[PDB]
Write a protein that binds this ligand. Structure first.
Ligand SMILES: CCCCCCCCCCCCCCCCCC(=O)OC[C@H](CO[C@@H]1O[C@H](CO[C@H]2O[C@H](CO)[C@H](O)[C@H](O)[C@H]2O)[C@H](O)[C@H](O)[C@H]1O)OC(=O)CCCCCCCCCCCCCCCCC
Ligand code: CLA
Ligand code: CLA
Ligand code: CLA
Ligand code: CLA
Ligand code: CLA
Ligand code: CLA
Ligand SMILES: CCCCCCCCCCCCCCCC(=O)OC[C@H](CO[C@@H]1O[C@H](CS(=O)(=O)O)[C@@H](O)[C@H](O)[C@H]1O)OC(=O)CCCCCCCCCCCCCCC
Ligand code: HEC
Ligand SMILES: CC1=C(/C=C/C(C)=C/C=C/C(C)=C/C=C/C=C(C)/C=C/C=C(C)/C=C/C2=C(C)CCCC2(C)C)C(C)(C)CCC1
Ligand SMILES: CC1=C(/C=C/C(C)=C/C=C/C(C)=C/C=C/C=C(C)/C=C/C=C(C)/C=C/C2=C(C)CCCC2(C)C)C(C)(C)CCC1
Ligand SMILES: [Cl-]
Ligand SMILES: [Cl-]
Ligand code: NA
Lengths: 244, 442, 334, 27, 97, 37, 30, 137, 36
């Protein structure tokens, strides 16, 4: 049974991905002579870990925990795309469309705000070969695109921007312009991230699957203004499968 | 000892002339109600929505289900005329009683009859006048119950098919619902009683209120105040005036928000869309416009990183983006068909938006309650052309001003009543200054 | 002499250096809450996403503000009118980001000032005074309700309430004018007349009284030692005063009943400030200032500009720039 | 006009004050 | 080395002709027969390696192919510029009136 | 529009709503007759 | 250094409030 | 400057015939435009689709051309999209859709020509202000 | 955090109770002229 809006509104359950019963240990078989889609893919983060910078050189810093300060605004959902069977029996999900980005800002120890565009935009993720069935041992691995956190019209507090805005520090009219170049010229990053989806629950009756995910991506670079941080996201997912 | 500018304070212990003043004044209210309706109707044009037309009284009648049909089209204007004419005619009876009692009639009642004579300090007589009026009010609340259930129903903007007049068969009686409204937060997403969104609950609530007023009407006739009440209050004409001024002020502030937020018993078909409604309609207007052109509204990143068309509320519901993220508690019959259980539903949005919903969104966005004092529609920078101030803005602003001044009247008269009741409203007796007998503070 | 009765007798004592009273029982804690959260926030709150667009605005001193530019920043547009106490946030870090302190301060502060007003009635009753000083205070109190509560209710968001900061105030009054043309609203014009008028009469009354002090001192001493606290006779001659001002204008444009003069002093600014409080409160419902944009045209239909259109040009530049990242659609409807 | 009827009504009121004050009534 | 890529683009054919790979959809109003139907189609099917590639879009009525032919001289193609196509900015670039 | 049979009275009804206000004015005429007493 | 200065002046004003109320020249009669 | 017949002479059709309006028609048009249209088209813009205005140059490149009395009168009877590819009476007010846009119900045929005539004259009087938007207010 | 909520609900209830019972404890009688 499914709930209504008025049941859910204001609870935070709207930000949660569907769960599958812990009995759902089936398998979902794949008829390479058929095509399938993902009617709904839901990703729900639960942990945000940021990589520190350890001063020296040969120490390599760790991932540290953060606090989320933007509330229950974090889940990706209603994602859909083609689910393909390749020559060798691997499966490839191809994201077509969905609510595939959420802006997030977590706060490191010391009160530094780290903003990021949590996303699977343009996700192409693939299994091993010779799958023949989706099971509680099946793992998708794929990369996606991380566009810039602000798009091109975004204006900084002095009215500077990329497709819009001032091209200089107009408050400092005869200031040495070279030392402000990094702050005056906005750049639009586009990076890649990696994701793993680990299926731990399958309902063979309904083509629903659920499991765990870990993704890696860059944080916000404020239109080229500072260096980005490395971000690790962990969470759970749900996806519904369908014949095309 | 009052000056001409406080002249009606001379009526305080003149029960007879005071009756005429109240009854003459009541004719003035019934007169305005009658004339204004006839003014409105004379000026009415049925091809125009009511809210392009400066109407406040006709929308009140249409909402009781008279003269309107499915989707709010006016079918018959005769009930509007009749309502006007009868109010207007009855103002003259009230006029008549009011001048007669104010001029010719006995200056004071208690000599002509002990029933209609009253003394403010008579706690039993006063609570008994209270009880009669409570029952009258009780009756009034039930007359609306009866219209809804036995005499044709009420306009239901939530009816399927664009709204309709609908008879209410199962009013809500469960006190957890009816009285739960009184316990809801007034803050956003809750809305206290202003959030009532179905006619069953409205008619339920009035069965309850009418019973309680009669209960209590009967109570106050049969009782007298207990000592804890006797020692807590001032028992004077002015002090009872001040108490009712508190309550009218309270009541007017509620009215203000009611007409500003509630689109159920102030249906937007009649009164225009609410501020929140119109803000939502614009996000809808441009979501439709852009998705038709090929935009994937659910994946479109806006300049901030937040969805250009769709984002998440702080508890996660999918909502309209832009500044209207503030208005996501809006609920409207044109919008609800797109709501799934996670908020707005991207598959319904992709697939099932209807032409009537496109029309409604376009309409309400272009009739947002923004206008100049001289009735130029739109934001403050818009040029002349559109002669339009939403009835909601006029109804909200008028009653805020009045609610405010009655709260001032309440402080004025309550402080004065306290002061007169203790014998120093006219100033400080020099030979006996309280502060001169108190020790110094330092 | 019962426990409760001694307590009730201290609360209402007219012997306490500061009067407490029943309204004071609520006012003291609510104002201590607001005050302590304001000071701590002004000094150290981190930046607040006032407009819901994940664009935090630094308000506090340790974050690079001075006394002029600092503020407690209004709570996030994402919250709109929702109630955001601390215990609704997952942590204080979240609550700080979203502007929770502002909501805490303004709510405590409104309550406590509401009670300040009652407290003013209460002591007047205990001292045997007439009661209406509190009606005088209702005009500022009304004005504070207007910009902290009513205007947000009507626009849908505490993020459009007035910031608690000097520059924040100017932001809010600049944006108000682009969205409401408050200068062309008559209730603001009476407010100016209420406030220019009260400044004028302040100076009149204080200049005329000071002009007609009775010689009591020498030129080596402050004239103020001419008056002793609680002396029974007046310390100026009001007929000399009436005789001067009545000749400055004409006899009947001057007072000579001191009770009518002081009531006039009280009533002019109070009434004008009631109206301007009403203006902010009714512009909360977008019943805006007079709009004379393109009202004058010529025989052919050319627009002939007036000063009203010049004002509109100014208003336009205010409109198109405020919250520059915040609108995805062409109408700033709230 | 409407200026015709609104003048007939606007005069009604002051006429009542006039008639009493002329024929010394209880004003 | 730090350049504004939007400003660099305004110095290419993008600054004189409708760029099939980059220009917001509202520019197809400048020529008749194009907006909204064909404009919808051109934007959905970008990018294009040459101006002529627009004629191979599947579903084109033979009338549609002639409205494109008449207008090919107002078109052009440059490298896709991420800043102009991210965000759905080809459908709405935040400019109204 | 009013019903046809009352068509005649239209300009009267355009003026009726204002009459309640005329009572306030009238109290001040009256007080001027008695010398604001 | 500027933060210390703004907060120090504010604190001095709060201190003066205290003295001016509790340690005022008391008003005496005639 | 005054409202002269040169300014009041507008094309009638695509063959470039012309029609000269009275001052009466012009003001009738201006009245009816405010009654039936300005709520979305104040100034010659379109509030619900700013990408499309009533500048004569935009009307000229509409399919069916609309820079004339005929095209404009037709559009009020049976609006289409800018390329003329689909009829939009469902969502744009028209005589064909007066069931749902009731203000269109009582518009006679001459009313439509005054509205059309008002729309073609006004850019001649106001220039860039018509269809220009706030930049030119 | 919930503990906090409890503490504030209790504090507020306590001060509001004070207020209401305070004014019900013969408050008109607390003036310098006429007590009743
Ligand atoms: C003047 C004249 C009249 C006389 C008046 C009478 C005098 C009385 C005056 C007293 C006023 C004292 C000043 C109060 C300071 C407020 C302290 C605070 O906000 O303190 C809060 C602290 C701070 O919390 C920390 O707050 C942090 C916030 O950090 C922020 O601050 C940092 C800098 O500090 C960095 O900048 C960081 O980036 C930034 O985000 C983090 O979120 C931490 O996780 C979080 O633990 O919390 C805690 O641990 C505190 C314990 C709460 C834990 C919850 C358990 C519930 C206990 C509730 C008790 C209720 C009180 C009882 C009421 C009465 C009943 C008898
Ligand atoms: C139910 C409503 C109600 C009632 C019955 C009373 C009754 C009374 N009041 Mg209270 N009063 C009220 C509401 C009410 N008041 C409100 C809401 C306020 C706040 C404004 C006041 C403020 C107030 C004060 C300050 C005083 C009274 C006083 C009085 C007494 C004498 C009043 C008199 O003779 O006025 C006679 C009428 C006039 C002098 C005319 C007033 C004209 C108004 C202000 C202008 C209206 C114009 C309007 C705004 C529209 C403008 C358009 C243009 C055409 C003019 C009387 C017992 C007096 C008192 O305490 O006596 C015991 C007194 O001094 N009243
Ligand atoms: C709703 C408004 C209202 C009402 C109902 C009243 C009512 C009253 N006032 Mg108050 N008053 C008001 C406003 C009002 N006043 C205002 C605004 C002011 C400030 C200017 C005052 C100042 C004032 C003073 C100074 C005094 C009163 C007094 C009185 C009472 C005696 C009237 C009398 O004998 O006059 C006599 C008046 C006339 C003979 C003139 C004729 C008036 C008639 C009734 C006009 C009706 C016309 C209408 C079209 C008739 C239709 C008839 C048809 C329905 C049959 C009466 C109960 C007096 C009082 O309290 O006495 C103890 C008194 O001394 N009033
Ligand atoms: C109290 C509730 C109330 C409300 C909300 C309205 C609201 C409305 N009326 Mg209505 N009306 C009312 C009372 C009310 N009126 C009263 C008491 C009368 C009798 C005089 C009328 C007589 C009336 C007429 C004759 C007309 C309206 C019209 C209108 C509309 C436009 C008003 C306008 O532009 O004013 C402009 C703004 C002002 C006049 C501001 C005055 C500010 C005052 C004087 C200060 C108040 C001080 C405090 C009390 C609007 C929907 C018009 C309309 O469109 O009808 C279809 C119209 O022709 N009304
Ligand atoms: C509003 C309340 C009110 C009050 C308390 C009074 C009180 C009084 N009046 Mg007054 N009177 C009123 C209204 C009021 N009147 C009205 C509205 C009129 C105008 C028609 C009059 C005209 C009037 C005259 C001419 C006389 C009195 C007299 C009296 C006294 C005796 C009443 C009696 O025994 O009648 C007997 C009681 C009845 C006949 C019962 C009537 C029941 C009514 C009709 C039903 C209720 C109507 C309903 C609520 C609403 C109408 C329906 C509509 C909505 C469609 C008494 C002091 C007399 C007096 O003082 O002599 C010196 C006197 O001669 N009155
Ligand atoms: C017009 C309405 C009206 C008025 C003016 C009165 C007036 C009075 N009643 Mg009556 N009463 C009424 C309706 C009314 N009653 C009805 C309908 C009922 C039936 C339920 C009763 C039942 C009733 C009883 C059973 C008793 C009274 C008593 C009294 C007296 C004491 C009032 C008191 O202390 O309250 C002041 C109120 C309090 C001290 C407690 C109120 C707490 C409330 C709920 C707080 C809410 C305020 C909040 C901020 C606003 C939001 C509402 C919230 C609930 C959501 C007074 C004469 C008393 C008396 O002396 O009896 C003879 C008494 O014992 N009344
Ligand atoms: C800020 C508004 C305000 C203020 C300052 C006053 C002040 C006054 N009122 Mg009034 N009162 C008000 C609004 C207000 N009132 C309203 C809206 C009503 C109608 C419901 C009343 C009803 C009323 C009555 C029935 C009586 C008074 C009386 C009085 C006087 C004596 C003290 C008293 O009983 O207060 C009582 C206090 C109130 C009624 C509520 C005031 C609200 C304060 C400002 C806040 C209280 C905090 C609250 C308990 C907790 C809320 C927050 C929490 C839930 C989170 C005093 C002049 C008494 C008097 O002698 O009059 C002649 C009297 O008997 N008042
Ligand atoms: C179409 C028709 C429309 C009709 C409309 C009619 C309009 C009039 C309505 C207003 C009536 C109100 C009564 C005024 C008299 C009164 O207040 O008495 C109080 C005193 C008493 O006078 C004093 O009078 C005393 C005698 S006695 O008390 O009055 O008996 C005497 O002792 C003393 O010397 C003398 O000064 O009057 C004055 O001193 C003048 C004060 C003016 C009061 C209004 C303040 C203006 C505020 C507006 C500011 C906004 C700008 C920002
Ligand atoms: C909103 C409720 C509108 C009303 C009322 C009127 N118009 Fe409109 N108009 C509107 C939209 C959204 C559009 C675009 C339609 C599309 O998708 O193509 C239009 C378009 C026009 C046009 C064409 C402009 C062009 O450049 O080709 C014209 C000529 C036009 N509309 C005229 C017109 C008239 C005369 C109106 C009053 C009778 C009227 N419109 C009302 C939105 C709305
Ligand atoms: C109809 C309806 C409904 C219902 C409603 C109801 C049921 C209501 C109720 C209501 C109520 C039931 C109310 C109550 C109120 C109360 C109050 C308002 C109170 C007050 C109080 C006071 C005022 C007091 C005070 C005091 C003090 C504190 C001290 C001493 C003195 C005194 C007494 C002053 C609903 C919503 C469902 C829907 C719609 C319709
Ligand atoms: C419905 C109707 C009716 C009825 C009517 C009536 C009821 C009316 C009345 C009316 C009235 C009731 C009127 C009155 C009026 C008045 C006026 C006209 C006033 C004026 C005033 C003035 C002008 C003022 C002045 C002054 C003075 C005196 C003093 C001080 C100063 C001043 C300046 C203020 C009839 C029959 C028609 C029939 C039909 C319908
Ligand atoms: Cl701003
Ligand atoms: Cl927006
Ligand atoms: Na013109």
């Amino acid at each position: 049974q499914t709930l209504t809006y008025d049941d859910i509104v204001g609870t935070g359950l709207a930000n949660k991905c569907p769960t599958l019963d812990d009995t759902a240990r089936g398998a979902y078989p794949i008829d390479s002579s058929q095509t399938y889609r993902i009617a709904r893919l839901c990703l729900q983060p639960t942990t945000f870990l940021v990589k520190e910078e350890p001063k020296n050189k040969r120490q390599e810093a760790e991932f540290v925990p953060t606090k989320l300060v933007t509330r229950e605004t974090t889940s990706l959902d209603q994602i859909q795309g083609e689910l393909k069977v390749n020559s060798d029996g691997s499966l490839t999900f191809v994201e077509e469309d969905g609510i595939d980005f959420q802006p997030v800002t977590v706060q490191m120890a010391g009160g530094e705000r780290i903003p990021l565009l949590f996303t699977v935009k343009n996700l192409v993720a693939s299994t091993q070969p010779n799958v023949t069935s989706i099971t509680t041992s099946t793992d998708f691995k794929g990369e996606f695109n991380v566009p810039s956190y602000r798009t091109a019209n975004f204006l900084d507090p002095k009215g500077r921007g990329l497709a819009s805005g001032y091209d200089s520090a107009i408050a400092l009219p005869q200031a040495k312009e070279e030392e402000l170049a990094r702050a005056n010229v906005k750049r639009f990053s586009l990076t890649k991230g990696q994701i793993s989806l680990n299926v731990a629950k399958v309902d063979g009756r309904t083509g629903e699957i659920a499991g765990t995910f870990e993704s890696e991506q860059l944080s916000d670079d404020d239109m080229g203004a500072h260096e980005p941080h490395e971000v690790k996201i962990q969470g759970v997912f749900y996806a519904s499968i369908e014949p095309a | 000892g009052f000056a001409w500018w406080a002249g009606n304070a001379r009526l305080i212990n003149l029960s007879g002339k005071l009756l005429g003043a109240h009854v003459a004044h009541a004719g003035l209210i019934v007169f305005w109600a009658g004339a204004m309706t006839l003014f409105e109707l004379a000026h009415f044009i049925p091809e125009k929505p009511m809210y392009e037309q400066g109407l406040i009284l006709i929308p009140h009648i249409a909402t009781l289900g008279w003269g309107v049909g499915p989707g709010g089209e006016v079918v018959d204007t005769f009930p509007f005329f009749v309502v006007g004419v009868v109010h207007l005619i009855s103002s003259a009876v009230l006029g008549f009683g009011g001048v007669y009692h104010a001029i010719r009639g006995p200056e004071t009642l208690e000599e002509y009859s002990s029933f209609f004579g009253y003394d403010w300090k008579d706690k039993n007589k006063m609570t008994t006048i209270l009880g009669f009026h409570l029952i009258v009010l009780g009756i009034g609340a039930l007359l609306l119950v009866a219209k809804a259930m036995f005499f044709g129903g009420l306009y239901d903007t939530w009816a399927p098919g664009g709204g309709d007049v609908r008879v209410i068969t199962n009013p809500t009686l469960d006190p957890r619902v009816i009285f739960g409204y009184l316990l809801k937060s007034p803050f956003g997403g809750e809305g206290w009683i202003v959030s009532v969104n179905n006619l069953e609950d409205v008619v339920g609530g009035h069965i309850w209120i009418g019973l309680i007023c009669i209960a209590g009407g009967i109570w106050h006739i049969l009782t007298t105040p207990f000592g804890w009440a006797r020692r807590a209050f001032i028992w004077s004409g002015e002090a009872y005036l001040s108490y009712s001024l508190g309550a009218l002020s309270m009541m007017g502030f509620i009215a203000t928000c009611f007409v500003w937020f509630n689109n159920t018993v102030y249906p937007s078909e009649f009164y225009g869309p609410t501020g929140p409604e119109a803000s939502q309609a614009q996000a809808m207007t441009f979501l439709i416009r852009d998705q038709k052109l090929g935009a994937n509204v659910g994946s479109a990143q806006g300049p901030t990183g937040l969805g250009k068309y769709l984002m998440r509320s702080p508890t996660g519901e999918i909502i309209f983006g832009g500044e209207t993220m503030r208005f996501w508690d809006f609920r409207g019959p044109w919008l609800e068909p797109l709501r799934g259980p996670n908020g707005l539903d991207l598959n319904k949005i992709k697939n099932d938006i209807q032409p009537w919903q496109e029309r409604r969104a376009a309409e309400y966005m272009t009739h947002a309650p923004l206008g100049s004092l001289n009735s130029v529609g739109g934001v403050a920078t818009e040029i002349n052309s559109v002669n339009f101030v939403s009835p909601r803005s006029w109804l909200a602003t008028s009653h805020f001003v009045l609610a405010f001044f009655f709260l001032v009247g309440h402080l004025w008269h309550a402080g004065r009543a306290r002061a007169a009741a203790a014998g120093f409203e006219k100033g400080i007796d020099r030979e006996s200054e309280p502060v001169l007998s108190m020790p110094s503070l330092d | 002499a019962n426990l409760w009765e001694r307590f009730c007798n201290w609360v209402t004592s007219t012997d306490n250096r500061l009067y407490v009273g029943w309204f004071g029982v609520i006012m003291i804690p609510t104002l201590l809450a607001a005050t302590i959260c304001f000071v701590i926030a002004f000094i150290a709150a981190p930046p607040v996403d006032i407009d819901g667009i994940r664009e935090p605005v630094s308000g506090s001193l340790l974050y690079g503000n001075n006394i002029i530019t600092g503020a407690v920043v209004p709570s996030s547009n994402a919250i709109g009118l929702h109630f955001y106490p601390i215990w609704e946030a997952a942590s204080l870090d979240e609550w700080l980001y979203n502007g929770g302190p502002y909501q805490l301060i303004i709510f405590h502060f409104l309550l406590g000032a509401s009670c300040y007003m009652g407290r003013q009635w209460e002591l007047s009753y205990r001292l045997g005074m007439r009661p209406w000083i509190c009606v005088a205070y209702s005009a500022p109190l009304a004005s504070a309700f207007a910009v902290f509560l009513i205007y947000p209710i009507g626009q849908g968001s505490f993020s459009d309430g007035m910031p608690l900061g000097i520059s924040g105030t100017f932001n809010f009054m600049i944006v108000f004018q682009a969205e409401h043309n408050i200068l062309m609203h008559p209730f603001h014009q009476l407010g100016v007349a209420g406030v220019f008028g009260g400044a004028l009469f302040c100076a009149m009354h204080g200049s005329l009284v000071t002009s007609s002090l009775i010689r009591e001192t020498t030129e080596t001493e402050s004239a103020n030692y001419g008056y002793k606290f609680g002396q029974e006779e007046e310390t100026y001659n009001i007929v000399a005063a009436h005789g001067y001002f009545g000749r400055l204008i004409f006899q009947y444009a001057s007072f000579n009943n001191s009770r009518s003069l002081h009531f006039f002093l009280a009533a002019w600014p109070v009434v004008g400030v009631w109206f301007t409080a009403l203006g902010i409160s009714t512009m909360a419902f977008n019943l805006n200032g007079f709009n004379f944009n393109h009202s004058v045209i010529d025989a052919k239909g050319n627009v002939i500009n007036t000063w009203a259109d010049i004002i509109n040009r100014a208003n336009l530049g205010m409109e198109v720039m405020h919250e520059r990242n915040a609108h995805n659609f062409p109408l700033d409807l709230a | 006009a409407q200026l015709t009827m609104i003048a007939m009504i606007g005069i009604a009121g002051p006429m009542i004050i006039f008639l009493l004050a002329v024929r010394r009534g209880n004003l | 080395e730090l350049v504004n890529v939007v400003d660099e683009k305004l110095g290419t054919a993008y600054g004189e002709k409708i760029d099939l790979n980059n220009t917001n959809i509202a520019a197809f109003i400048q020529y008749r027969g194009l907006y909204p139907t064909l404009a919808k189609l051109i934007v959905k099917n970008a990018p294009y390696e040459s101006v002529e590639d627009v004629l191979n879009i599947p579903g084109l009525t033979e009338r549609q192919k002639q409205i494109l032919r008449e207008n090919l001289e107002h078109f052009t193609v440059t490298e896709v510029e991420t800043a102009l196509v991210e965000g759905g900015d080809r459908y709405n670039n935040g400019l109204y009136k | 529009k009013l019903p046809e049979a009352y068509a005649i009275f239209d300009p009267l009804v355009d003026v009726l709503p204002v009459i309640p206000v005329l009572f306030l004015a009238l109290a001040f005429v009256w007080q001027a007759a008695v010398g604001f007493r | 250094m500027e933060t210390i200065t703004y907060v120090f002046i504010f604190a001095c004003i709060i201190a003066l409030f205290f003295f001016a109320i509790f340690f005022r020249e008391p008003p005496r009669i005639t | 400057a005054e409202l002269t017949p040169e300014v009041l002479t507008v094309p009638l059709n695509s063959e470039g015939k012309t029609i000269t309006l009275t001052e009466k028609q012009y003001l009738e048009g201006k009245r009816l435009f405010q009654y039936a249209c300005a709520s979305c088209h104040v100034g010659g813009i379109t509030k619900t689709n700013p990408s499309l205005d009533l500048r004569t140059e935009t009307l000229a490149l509409a399919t069916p051309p609309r820079d004339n009395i005929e095209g404009l009168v037709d559009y009020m009877k049976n609006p289409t999209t800018y390329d003329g590819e689909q009829e939009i009476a469902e969502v744009h007010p028209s005589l064909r859709s007066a069931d749902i846009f009731p203000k269109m119900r009582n518009l006679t045929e001459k009313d439509l020509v005054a509205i059309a005539g008002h729309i073609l004259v006004e850019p001649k009087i106001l220039g860039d202000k018509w269809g220009g938007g706030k930049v030119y207010y | 955090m919930e503990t906090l909520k409890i503490t504030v609900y209790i504090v507020v209830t306590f001060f509001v109770l004070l207020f209401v019972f305070g004014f019900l404890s013969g408050d008109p009688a607390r003036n310098p002229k006429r007590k009743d």
